[PDB]
Amino acid sequence: GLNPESADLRALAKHLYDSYIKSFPLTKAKARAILTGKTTDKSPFVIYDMNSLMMGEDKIKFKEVAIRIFQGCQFRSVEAVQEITEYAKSIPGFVNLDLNDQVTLLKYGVHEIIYTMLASLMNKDGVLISEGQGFMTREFLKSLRKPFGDFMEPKFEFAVKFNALELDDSDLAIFIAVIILSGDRPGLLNVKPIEDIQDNLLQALELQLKLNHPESSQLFAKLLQKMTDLRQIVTEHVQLLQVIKKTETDMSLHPLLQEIYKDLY
Ligand SMILES: Cc1nnc(-c2ccc(OCCCOc3ccc(CCC(=O)O)c(F)c3)c(F)c2)s1
């Protein structure tokens, strides 16, 4: 904030953080407080096997077991899409873009955002579910029958490496906006207005990380590099769905996810 240009970058960071808080009900700071046993929040019920999953169904409240779980992740993605869409609308310039490009930017951005923010709810042993009321172990997720036995592993591998960056919600707010305003999504009609916005967002992210993580060298670059991992998670998940739909012909797909995945990659 030391000159007027950089003060406007601060104002943009604060705007996005504010909108993020308003849009996403379970923040990283709340997730971390649940996972680490802090006294601001309530310990989760832990599901690590079939009997504890049965108990959990009664305690949390919220068909083979693998399919119920897989579909539960899809319902969560649909809620996430709703929240990401409302956040996207708050990004200055987004709603003024061509409507076709608004739709394309959401279509290709929402999963990258979902896996970014999924890391906030993960550690190397498992993941928060039902808004933090439950915690499902990574080993229980690995135990599910084929073809569902490894669908969570790439997301855990990503999370453990992403979490070592030690980003907070104020950082994440800007990073998620940068993800959405990507000028290289396929089929965009007007790239230039997108990149002008993305430029501003990147400038704000960069100053946010230098202020908030003054001791953490090239954090900005190391964060942008993680956009590689996110892309690979997505393309791998799409391949897995192609497999699942051949053996599991009785599995339905929420219409929002169907539209998103159509001709995605
Ligand atoms: C009985 C039960 N019924 N539901 C249960 C349940 C268990 C675990 C859940 O979440 C674990 C973390 C979310 O992980 C993700 C999220 C999104 C995707 C991508 C999905 C797509 O968009 O295609 C993903 F692949 C994994 C959960 F929400 C519900 S237990």
Residue numbers in the entry: 203 to 264, 275 to 477
Copy text from the publication.
The nuclear hormone receptor PPARγ is one of the three peroxisome proliferator-activated receptors (i.e., PPARγ/α/δ), that have been exploited as drug targets for combating multiple diseases, in particular metabolic syndrome-related disorders and cancer. Upon recruitment of specific cofactors, these heterodimers transactivate PPAR-responsive elements (PPREs) of target genes involved in insulin signaling, lipid and glucose metabolism, immune response, as well as cell cycle and differentiation. In order to proactively evaluate the deep interactome learning framework for protein structure-based drug design, potential new ligands targeting the binding site of the human peroxisome proliferator-activated receptor (PPAR) subtype gamma are generated.
Compound 1 exhibited the desired and predicted dual activity on PPARγ and PPARδ at half maximal effective concentration EC50(PPARγ) = 1.5 ± 0.2 μM, and EC50(PPARδ) = 0.24 ± 0.05 μM, respectively. To investigate the binding pose of compound 1, X-ray structure determination of the ligand-protein complex with PPARγ was conducted (SI10). Compound 1 was bound to one of two protein molecules in the asymmetric unit. Compound 1 bound in the orthosteric site lined by helices H3 and H11. The buried propionic acid head group is engaged in four intermolecular hydrogen bridges. In the empty PPARγ site, the carboxyl C-terminus of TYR477 is blocking the site by binding in a similar position as the propionic acid head of the ligand. The ligand’s tail moiety is exposed to the solvent, and the propylene glycol-like linker allows the ligand to enter the hydrophobic part of the binding pocket, where the two aromatic ring systems engage in additional interactions with the protein.
